[PDB]
Structures are given as C-alpha cells and as structure tokens.
C-alpha cells in the first residue's frame, strides 16, 4: 500500500502551502490600518487536523478552518489619522513578526521534507514495477 503515501504527502504539501500563505499574508499586513470593510486587519491562522475519516487509523493532514488569532489589538495613539477611535486609539493588527518568520521557515522545511518523501516513494514504486524483470 505505497500508493496511499501519494495522498498523505500531497495533503501535507497542500496544508503546509496554505499555512505558509496565511503566515505571509499576516506578515505583509503587519502595518495595515484598514480592511475592505473598514475593520482593522485581524491576524489569522490555520488549524491542522488529522485527515482521517471515522475508522481510519492514520492519515495525512488537513486544514480545518482559518481562525482569527487571539491577541490584543495593538493600540496606537494617532488622533490625527482619519481612522481613529473615540479617544484616538487606532487599532493595528496583532501580528507577531518573529512568530510569522519562524512559521514561514517551519512551513518551508516541512514542505521540503514531504517532497523528499514523495520522491523516494516514487522511486520505490518504479523499482517494485521492476520486480521480476
């Protein structure tokens, strides 16, 4: 049953790509002040779950949902900017830059590991196809 490794590692690659994309989106908007609806940008993060249907022992990984990060919104005193609060408290995203950079590095490394898994699995499938010949 080496074919299931294709599904497992492909799901892992897709999930890590989504995680890296979300981390990069958070990082690129660390300095944002406004959203499309006027709301401040809220740092977002993916949720990882075991991609196993009920009764399946072990599977790959899947992104359940994207959730707003739990952290206080960064308050900035700029009661001159057109966007402000009642007391001039501009709300800026709660992005922790070090966390996002480390997340990007971790996602890249896990991605590369899954690529190696896929490569060696394909090599083994070819060798198995050359069983008796």
């Amino acid at each position: 049953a080496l074919l299931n490794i294709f599904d497992i590692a492909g799901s892992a690659l897709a999930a890590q790509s989504k995680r890296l994309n979300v981390a990069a989106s958070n990082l690129a908007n660390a300095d944002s002040v406004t959203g499309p609806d006027g709301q401040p940008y809220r740092a977002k993060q993916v949720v990882f779950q075991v991609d196993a249907a009920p009764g399946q022992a072990t599977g790959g990984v899947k992104v359940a949902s994207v959730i707003e990060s739990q952290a206080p919104e960064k308050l900035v005193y700029e009661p001159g900017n057109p966007l402000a609060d009642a007391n001039g408290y501009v709300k800026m995203p709660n992005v922790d830059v070090v966390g996002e950079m480390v997340n990007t590095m971790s996602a890249s490394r896990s991605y590369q590991a899954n690529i190696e898994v896929l490569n060696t699995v394909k090599s083994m499938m070819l060798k198995t196809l050359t069983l008796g010949q």
């Binding site: 492909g10 690659l13 897709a14 790509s17 896929l118 394909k122 196809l129």
Partner: protein
C-alpha cells in the same frame, strides 16, 4: 466482463488519468486561479507511475503470448 474488456477498461482508465493530469497542467500554465502547483506535480507523478504500470503489464502479456505461441503441438 471479459479479458479483452478488462484490458480495454485498464487502458481507458490510464489514458483518462493521464489526460486529467495534462489538462490540469495546461490549466495551471494558463494562469487560471485555484490550481496549485503541488497538485499539478503530484498528478503528473501519479500519471507517470500509471503509465509505467501499463507498460510493464504489456511487456509481460506479450512475453506470455510469445511463450504460448512457441509451444510445439
């Protein structure tokens, strides 16, 4: 239903998989949204493995046919 039918079904399945991978690759090269390079590359990998399986089955089948036709009656 029959052996020829099973072989035709296997060939159709392999060709359909290869065509699906090729179509997804062309869609990605087109720039259409939602198609990820990960899926393209994995599907091309799977199509290559399936093609190799079909080639091996053909090789053996031909070898067995040659062996049977070599029988002296």
């Amino acid at each position: 239903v029959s052996f020829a039918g099973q072989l035709h079904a296997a060939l159709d399945r392999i060709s359909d998989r290869q065509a699906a991978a090729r179509v997804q690759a062309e869609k990605f090269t087109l720039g259409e949204p939602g198609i990820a390079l990960n899926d393209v590359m994995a599907d091309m990998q799977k199509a290559s493995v399936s093609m190799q399986m079909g080639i091996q089955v053909r090789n053996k089948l031909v070898a067995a046919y040659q062996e049977v036709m070599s029988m002296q009656v």
